[PDB]
Chain A
Amino acid sequence: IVGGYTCGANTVPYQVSLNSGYHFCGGSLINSQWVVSAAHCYKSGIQVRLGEDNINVVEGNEQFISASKSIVHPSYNSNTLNNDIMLIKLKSAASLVASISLPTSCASAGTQCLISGWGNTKSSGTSYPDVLKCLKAPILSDSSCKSAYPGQITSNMFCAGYLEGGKDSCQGDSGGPVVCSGKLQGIVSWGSGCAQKNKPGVYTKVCNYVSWIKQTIASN
């Protein structure tokens, strides 16, 4: 997260860290046994870390649980990142750290949201934080979004952030939450650089997938 602020411990209880030896992506806990992340975060042998604040210091709220399976969306396109959504089942249920509710309707442009993660904090150069970082940012008009990334935005994506640059998600934030008024509306997905002018963040549109999520959980 660049241009953000220190969330503070347990202020984002649904935030998850995906760890394969190192933190590589984020995720959102949607119930005691299931995490929502990005399809491009898929790998085998994911360990899910809940209740994290400082990912480099055990502080007391951590629950590290193996992923028993990771279901990538059937129509995920690894090249264009369309349908960039993945479900991870925990090997054992987490102790409820709390889940975030799914959306019942899509949010509109201009809506203020909370984006968070342990991603790089620099637009230029590199700095990876120990503690969880947060950013408040508005959803942008589908018009702005498409103009920023011509030929690349699908109906399953939205832009959020600041066209003037300086505040954005970044490498290490993928899979993580975009929450707007208590609902998970987005998944950190892609962008050109981080916090560059006219290059806002692009996010998976979670409201398009509520049905797939339910059905997938029920059959797995």
Chain B
Amino acid sequence: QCSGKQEWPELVGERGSKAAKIIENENEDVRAIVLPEGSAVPRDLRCDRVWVFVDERGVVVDTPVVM
């Protein structure tokens, strides 16, 4: 159980940089991290982190969530 909004289905298909700003505005406790789709990541669990995975066109490729 983390705090605030947890998932952004509406952002799939949006530009990464744009989604990151929206995410950080809608949940002030997280930082959005834009990564290329398929980027390797640490295996910790966080309530203050939202990965935003983008394809080569910088488009959000999957639902960003707090994790």
Question: Which residues of A line the B interface, CB within 8 A?
Answer: 21-25, 38, 40-41, 81, 119-120, 126, 128, 149, 152, 169-175, 188-192, 194, 201-202
Q: Is A171 within 8 A of B45, CB to CB?
A: yes
Question: Which of B1, B42, B47 sits near A190, CB closer than 8 Å?
Answer: B42
Interface size in chain B (residues, C-beta < 8 A): 14
The A contact surface, by secondary structure, is loop
Q: Is A191 within 8 A of B40, CB to CB?
A: yes
Q: Is A126 within 8 A of B42, CB to CB?
A: no
Nearest CB in chain A: distance from B67 CB, A: 6
Q: Is A171 within 8 A of B67, CB to CB?
A: yes
Q: Which residue of B lies closest to A169 (CB)?
A: B43
Question: Which of A21, A25, A201 sits near B44, CB closer than 8 Å?
Answer: A25
The A-contacting residues of B in range 26-67, CB under 8 angstroms, are: 38-47, 65, 67
The B contact surface, by secondary structure, is loop
Mind listing 7 A-B residue pairs with CB under 8 Å?
A: A119-B43, A120-B67, A126-B67, A128-B45, A190-B43, A192-B40, A202-B40
Q: What residues on B are CB-neighbors of A81 within 8 Å?
A: 42
Nearest CB in chain A: distance from B3 CB, A: 10
7 smallest beta-carbon distances between A and B, as pairs:
A172-B45, A174-B43, A174-B44, A192-B40, A40-B42, A24-B45, A25-B44
Q: Is B40 within 8 A of A22, CB to CB?
A: no
Q: Which residue of A lies closest to B62 (CB)?
A: A124
Against A, the Cβ 8 Å flags (1 = close, 0 = not) of B1-44 are 11000000000000000000000000000000000001111111
